[PDB]
Amino acid sequence: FRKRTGDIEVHEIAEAAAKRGYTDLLVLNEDRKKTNALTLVHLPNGPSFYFTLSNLQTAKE
Amino acid sequence: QDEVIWQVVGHEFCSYRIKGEAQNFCRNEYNVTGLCNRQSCPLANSRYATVREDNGKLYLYMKTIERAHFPSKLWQRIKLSKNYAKALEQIDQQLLYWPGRQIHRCKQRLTRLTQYLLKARRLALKHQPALIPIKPKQAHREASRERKALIAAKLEKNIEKELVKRLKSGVYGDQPLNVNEEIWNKVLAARE
Amino acid sequence: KYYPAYRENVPKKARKAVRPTKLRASLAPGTVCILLAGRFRGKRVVVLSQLEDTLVVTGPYKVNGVPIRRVNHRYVIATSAPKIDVSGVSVEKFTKAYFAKQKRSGPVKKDEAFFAENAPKNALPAERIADQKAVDAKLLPAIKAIPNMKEYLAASFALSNGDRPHLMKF
Amino acid sequence: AQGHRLYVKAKHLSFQRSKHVIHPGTSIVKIEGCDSKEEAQFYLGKRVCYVYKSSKAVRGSKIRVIWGTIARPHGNSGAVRARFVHNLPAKTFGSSLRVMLYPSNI
Amino acid sequence: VNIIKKRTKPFKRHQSDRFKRVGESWRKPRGIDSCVRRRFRGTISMPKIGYGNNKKTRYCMPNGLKAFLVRNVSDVELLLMHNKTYAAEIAGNVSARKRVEIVEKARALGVKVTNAGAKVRSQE
Amino acid sequence: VRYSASPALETKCAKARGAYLRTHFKNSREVAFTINGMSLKKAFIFLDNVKEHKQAVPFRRFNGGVGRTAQGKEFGVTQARWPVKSVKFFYDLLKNAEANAEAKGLDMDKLIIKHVQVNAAPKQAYLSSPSHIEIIVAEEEEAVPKAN
RNA sequence: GUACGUGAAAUUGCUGAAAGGGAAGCAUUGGAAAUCAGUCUUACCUGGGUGAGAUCAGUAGUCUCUCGAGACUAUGCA
RNA sequence: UUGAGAAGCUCAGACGAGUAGGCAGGCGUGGAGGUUUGUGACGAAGCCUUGGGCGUGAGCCUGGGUCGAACAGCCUCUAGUGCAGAUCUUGGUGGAAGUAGCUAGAUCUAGCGAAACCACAGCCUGGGGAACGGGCCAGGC
C-alpha cells in the first residue's frame, strides 16, 4: 500500500509504478468516510476496469 | 428622483433584494458590493460605476443622470487592461472627480474579479475529480436486484461444489495436503 | 490582486515594545542546575550562557551525555553547588539560529519519495560535535579540580520519601 | 529501589463548595508535606496533573493525563485550589495527583 | 476574533421529558404556583435576553462564517465580495444536477460551501 | 417477505411464517421463548412431550395466574402450563420450516431454531389477540482449524 | 401483493448494548464507552529561459453605438 | 477611512424580580396579489434520525435514510391561524390480565375469555409550623 499524496494522478502513478516492477494498480475511491468505487489498471498499458463497491463488510462485522 | 426611487425600492419592495438575517443582498447584476445599501443601489444612484466580467475580460460600467431614461444607452462600457496597474489607472481616469467612495468600491471589485479569474485559470490546469450525481431510483433498483442476485448466487453451495470438484480432478499433487486421511480414503474409493 | 478587496480593518498601533528578559539572580553561567522537564529530566547540567529567554546549557558529554541544548529558565532548578569556570570557552556561536530547527525544505518532485516514500534521513553534522568536543575540553579540568563534581553531574536528581521541596534548600 | 519521582504527591479532596452548592471548576488539592498556607505559596503556579489509565489504548499508550495549575491556597492547613484543563471527575475524590516542580523560581 | 457562545444547551419546555404529548419546544410557564416560573433552586433555566450572544459574532458558524442559503448559481455569485464573511449553503431541495454546478462555481469564487459533498460521488 | 432477523438469507436458513393465527398471543409468546435456540430435532420431542403432558412450558413473563408445577425445574422456575393449541401451531410451523430446509438441500442434522418471534395480529368486549409467528432454522455455525 | 400511495405517535414482540439494596425522575460539572463535525501547503513575491497571443503593432478592414467606445477579421509576436 | 438600508453608522453613562394590567417587536399556519428571468422524477411535499449548524426564544437551515409530484423565500393582502388540560370530541392503544370468571377432560388440566380503576409511585422513625407522608431534612433498613 502507498498512501496517495498531493497531486499525483492515476496515469502518473501507473507510469511510475511500471518502472518499479508493478503489474496491477488498484485505486480505492472513498468519499464521506465510505469506500464506493474501485478502479484497477493493468500496467503498463493494459485495460483499466472501473467498478463500484457496495455492501462493504470487514471481518469483525 | 434618486431619493424618491430609494424610498420606493429600498424600503417597500425590490425584486432584487435577498433578505438575510444579518444583511440584505442585491440580485442586481450592476451592484458593486452585492449588498442592499443606499450607496450600492444601482437603481437609486443616478451616477453609478461598477466592474463586471464578460468572457474573461473585466469592464468598467458607468451610467450618468443624463441617460437615465434611455435604458438601452444607460450604461457605458470600457475595457480594463490585464495589467493590474494600468487597470487601476483606467478606473481613476474614467471616474475622475467622482466621489472617493465610488472609486474605492470599483477598485475593490476589480481585485475580487481579478482573483476569481486567476482562480478560474488555476482550476482549469489542475486535475479535479468530476462530481457524478447519485440517482435515488437507480440506487433503489440496484439494491433490490442485488439482494435477489446474492440469494440466487448460493455462494456457499457453489464454493463447496467447485472445491469438491477440483478435489476429484486432483489439481493438487499425489495426495492433497488439505484433506484428512479418512476423507482422502473415501475420495479414492468413490472416484475409482 | 493588490488593492484591498475587503474592509481590512488594520490593527490599531500596539504599544508593546520588546524589552530584554530579566533572568533570575541564581541562574548565572557556570551554575550546576537540575533539568525539570524534557527527555533529560533529573539530569544535572552546567549553564554555559543565558540566551534571550532560555539558558544555553550542557552537561559534559562524558559525564551525563547531555549535549549543548537550550532549556527554558522556568524548567530549571538552580542548585547552590560551586560554580564552574566557563569564561574560558567562547559562547558567541550559541545564538538563536544556531539551535533553530533546520528549515523543512527539499523540492521533492512527484512520485519517488513523494509517493513511493523513499524519504531521506537526518543526522547531526560533525560541526555540532566539533564545537561540543571543545566545550568539555575547556570544562572537564574545571570540574575535576573540585571534588565530587564529576560524580555529581553524572547522577540524576530524584525525590525520596519524606522530602519536602518547599522546606529543603537546593 | 529508587524511581524518578520529580514531582510531589497530592490528593484530590473535593470541589470548591459551600454547604449545598458545588463548583467543579475549582478543585481543592492537598499537597502532602505542605501544612500551612504560607508553605502553600511555594506550590502556587506549579503544574498539577491527574494520571489515570483507560482500557482502550491510544497511540499504543493506555495512560491519559489531565493537566492543571495550582492557583491559590485554601484554608489554613495548606490545601490549595487547582484549575484543570478539564474539570476533574467527581469520582476522583481521594485520588492521587502529581504536582510538578515547574514552573520554577528557585 | 473568536466566537463565544454564552450557552450551548437548548432550553427545553418544562415537564417535556415526562410526557410525549408535551413537546420539547420552549413554552413560557404560565402557572403561578409553578416552581420553574418563580426560578427556585434546582429548577431549569429559562430563555432570558442575558443569554443573547455578541452582536458581532451573532449568526456566525464555529469557523467564523455566516450561512447563506443558495438555490442556484446566481445566488452563489452574490458572495464574490463577501467570501471571507459568508459560506454558501445549498438548499435541501436543489437537485444534484445543480449542486455540482454550484460547487464548481463556488470553487472559482473562493467561497466555502457547508454541504458541498451531498448527493454526489467522486471520480478521480 | 422480510423477517425481523437479519438472517433468513438463502445461505443456511429456512423460513416458516404464520399470520393471523387463531391463538392467544400471550400463550404463544411463552412457547416461542422456550424453544428458541434449541435444536430442531429436540424441539419436536419437546412439543410431543407437551401434547402428552410429559413436559410443561414455563411461563416467565406472563406468569400471572400460573400455578406451581414440578416439571419446570429444568428451566429453573416453577410456573408452567401445558398449552396445546399454541403448541399445535408451532408444530405445524416447525414442520413447514423443516420441509423448507429439506427442499433447500440443507444439512438436516445440524438444524437449530435460530430465531422465533411472535407478534400481535390485529384484534378481532371479547376482542381476542391473534398471533403472527415466524420461525427461522439454520445450521449450527462451526469453526475450522486455522493452519496446523 | 387487493390486510395494497406516504405510513407519525401511543402500544407490542425479538435482538443487541448498558444499568439495576424499596421508584423512576431532571438539572449542573466532568470521566468512561460509542459516535460525529474538521479542518491541512498553496499560494504569494521575485526571476531567467523557451515559445505562445491582444486590450501590443513606426499595422490594414467590417459591424453596432457615438471623433472614440465596444465586437470581431486579416497580418506581424520586434 | 471609504462606516449615507439617515429606517444607516457611531460614542458615552446608568440600569435589569414581577402577579393583575399597559406597551413594543418578532416566530409559525391555510389561502390571495406581486416577486425570486425561484426549487423539483439527476427526486417536490411529508415522515424518520445518538448527523451538523443558527437564534435568548418562538423557530429556522442542513446531511443521511425513507419517499414519490408537487413546492418555497421576500413585499403586501387575508383568516375557520398555533393546545397538555375543558369528569373536552372522535379514533387508536395499554397496565389491571390471561385476572375475574365460563365451555370440556381428569379441585387440577385444556379451550374461550372480561370490566371497574389507572398523575407517578410504594419500609419505617421522628421533626418538619401550611397536611406534611408518599416524595422534603437527620436516622435506621
DSSP state of B35: B
* C-beta atoms of C41 and D4 within 8 A: yes
* C-beta atoms of A12 and C110 within 8 A: yes
What grid cell was written down for F10?
438463502
Give the span between the Cα atoms of F30 and F27, in whole angstroms.
5
Q: Is D16 left (phi over 0), alpha (psi -120 to 50) or beta?
A: beta
Q: Tell me which H or E stretch contains E102.
A: helix E96-108
* C-beta atoms of E109 and B116 within 8 A: yes
Give the span between the Cα atoms of B143 and B137, in whole angstroms.
10
Is residue C31 within 8 A of residue C47, CB to CB? The reply is yes
Task: Determine the straight-line distance between the first and last CA of chain E, rounded to whole angstroms.
Answer: 37
Sign for the pseudo-dihedral over CA of C70, C72, C73, C78 = negative
Q: Tell me which H or E stretch contains F96.
A: helix F85-104
Sheet with F13-21, strands from edge to edge, namely F13-21, F131-139, F111-120
Closest-CA residue of A relative to B142 is: A54
C with F: 3 or more CB pairs under 8 Å?
no
Give the span between the Cα atoms of B86 and B93, in whole angstroms.
10
Give chains near E: 3+ CB pairs under 8 A.
Answer: A, B, C
Give the span between the Cα atoms of F95 and F81, in whole angstroms.
23
Q: In chain B, where does DSSP find H-type helix?
A: 2-11, 84-94, 100-125, 136-153, 155-168, 181-191
- Dihedral angle at the C-alpha atoms of F71, F76, F81, F85, nearest 10 degrees? -110
Q: Please, how many CA atoms are within 13 Å of residue D15, restricted to the half-sphere of its CB?
A: 17
Give the span between the Cα atoms of C92 and B128, in whole angstroms.
53
Q: Is the CB of C3 inside 8 Å of chain B's CB atoms?
A: yes
Q: Please, how many CA atoms are within 13 Å of residue B100, restricted to the half-sphere of its CB?
A: 0
| Beta carbons within 10 angstroms of residue F13's beta carbon | 22
| Beta carbons within 10 angstroms of residue F96's beta carbon | 16
Q: Which residues are CB-contacts of F35 (< 8 A; sequence separation ≥ 6)?
A: F43, F46, F47, F90, F113, F116
CB pairs under 8 A between A and E: 15
Give chains near F: 3+ CB pairs under 8 A.
Answer: B
User: Which of A30, A55, A56, A57 would best serve as a mutation to test chain B binding (most B beta carbons within 10 A)?
Assistant: A55
User: Which of C108, C111, C112, C114 would best serve as a mutation to test chain A binding (most A beta carbons within 10 A)?
Assistant: C111
Give chains near D: 3+ CB pairs under 8 A.
Answer: C
Cis peptide bond prior to C107, omega within 30° of 0: no
SS3 E7: coil
Nominal resolution in Å?
A: 3.0
Q: Is residue A34's beta carbon less than 7 angstroms from any atom in nucleic acid strand G? A: no
- Segment 113-172 of chain B within 8 Å of chain A by CB: 126-127, 142-143, 146
Q: How is chain C split among helix, strand and coil, in percent rounded to 5?
A: 20, 15, 65
Residue nearest to nucleotide H96 (CA to C1'): F64
Give the span between the Cα atoms of C50 and C78, in whole angstroms.
13
Residue type, B50: T
Task: Label residues A16-45 b or e (16+ Cβ within 10 Å = b).
Answer: bbeeeeeeebebebebeeeebbebebebee
Give the span between the Cα atoms of F131 and F114, in whole angstroms.
20
Residue with cell 521533492: C108
Residue with cell 416461542: F32
- Strand G nucleotides with an atom less than 7 Å from a protein beta carbon: 3, 9-10, 12-15, 24-34, 36-38, 41, 43-45, 55, 65-66, 69-72
Residue with cell 463497491: A53
Q: From the list F10, F12, F105, which residue is nearest B151 (CB)? A: F10
- Contacts of D85-90 with CB under 8 Å at 24 or more apart are D87/D24, D87/D25, D87/D27, D88/D12, D88/D24, D88/D27, D88/D50, D90/D15, D90/D24
H104 C1' – F122 CA distance, angstroms? Answer: 28
Query: Residue C9's Cα: distance from chain center in Å?
Result: 40
Give the span between the Cα atoms of C89 and C135, in whole angstroms.
6
Total residues found in chain A within this entry: 61
Which residues of B are less than 8 Å from A12 in CB distance? Answer: none
Closest-CA residue of C relative to A7 is: C110
Residue with cell 431614461: B69
Q: Which residues are CB-contacts of B138 (< 8 A; sequence separation ≥ 6)?
A: none
SS3 E45: coil
Q: Nearest nucleotide by C1' from F20 CA?
A: G3
Beta bridge partners of F80: F58
Q: Which residues of A touch E (CB under 8 A)?
A: 9-10, 27, 29, 31-32, 36-37
Cis peptide bond prior to A44, omega within 30° of 0: yes
What grid cell was written down for F45?
420431542
| Beta carbons within 10 angstroms of residue B15's beta carbon | 7
Is residue F95 within 8 A of residue F121, CB to CB? The reply is no
Computed on alpha carbons and rounded to an integer, the radius of gyration of chain B in Å comes to: 37
If we measure between CA atoms, which residue out of D93, D98, D99 comes closest to residue D24?
Answer: D93
* C-beta atoms of B115 and E122 within 8 A: no
If we measure between CA atoms, which residue out of B128, B151, D85 comes closest to residue F7?
Answer: B151
Q: Which residues of D touch C (CB under 8 A)?
A: 2-8, 33-34, 39, 42-43, 100-106
In the 40-99 segment of chain F, residues within 7 Å (Cβ) of strand H are 53, 62-67, 69, 81-86
Which residues of B are less than 8 Å from E105 in CB distance? Answer: none
Please tell me the distance in Å from B161's CA to the nearest CA on chain F.
13
Q: Is C151 left (phi over 0), alpha (psi -120 to 50) or beta?
A: alpha
Which residues of A are less than 8 Å from E117 in CB distance? Answer: 31-32
Method: cryo-EM
Query: Residue B40's Cα: distance from chain center in Å?
Result: 27
CB pairs under 8 A between B and C: 20
Residue type, C122: N
| Beta carbons within 10 angstroms of residue D93's beta carbon | 14
DSSP state of B123: H
- Dihedral angle at the C-alpha atoms of E114, E116, E118, E123, nearest 10 degrees? -150
Phi, psi dihedral angles at F134 (to 5 degrees): -130, 135
Q: Nearest nucleotide by C1' from B59 CA?
A: G70
Is residue F139 within 8 A of residue F20, CB to CB? The reply is no
Residue D70, CA distances (Å) to D25, D30, D83, D100, F65 in order: 13, 11, 7, 10, 66
Q: Is residue B76's beta carbon less than 7 angstroms from any atom in nucleic acid strand G? A: yes
If we measure between CA atoms, which residue out of B81, B11, B6, B26 comes closest to residue B51?
Answer: B81
Cα angle at C112 between C108 and C118, to 5 degrees? 90
